[PDB]
Ligand SMILES: Cc1ccccc1-c1cc(=O)c(O)c(C(=O)O)[nH]1
């Protein structure tokens with residue numbers, strides 16, 4: 001099952017978190033399996049992205065409960081002066097001094113980019129695909145190629161792990 005794969009291929013903290021997020025909003029990961037597996041993959045991106053960095057470069061926001069998330073956001077704005085987003089972003093960058101929205105899609109990167117841009121308003125956008133493809137505002141990719149390589153590989157690995165289990169097609173088509 002997809003769900004097996006999720007518990008089998010992701011550190012529990014992440015699976016724990018994905019399960020909390022879904023089940024609090026009345027979604028079953030035993031049913032919404034491809035969503036379970038998508039939420040995990042996003043989180044891991046976000047965590048990875050955060051921890052590739054001025055020792056402490058980024059502020060993780062995705063992962064946190066909504067009290068904490070908006071606390072950290074309200075804290076950041078109140079001291080840096082950067083405008084408050086209408087929707088919770090995944091990261092803030094204390095170096096480039098702006099929020100980031102991390103997208104991960106199984107479709108093309110320019111499509112998911114437009115979707116993202118469309119919804120937001122001054123947040124940096126970065127999209128990763130599972131094909132080692134990415135696209136980011138002003139093509140400002142924000143990270144030393146070194147780091148961006150590691151995500152791309154992980155995502156590709158997750159793609160390819162799904163395909164070992166004949167799970168890719170299901171997943172690819174559920175976005
Ligand atoms: C991962 C995911 C699955 C289904 C619907 C929305 C999302 C999602 C994607 C994001 O990139 C994201 O930043 C969030 C979010 O809750 O902040 N949710």
Ligand SMILES: [Mn+2]
Pocket residue numbers: 062088089090
């Ligand atoms: Mn987010």
Ligand SMILES: [Mn+2]
Pocket residue numbers: 042090101102103104
């Ligand atoms: Mn995101």
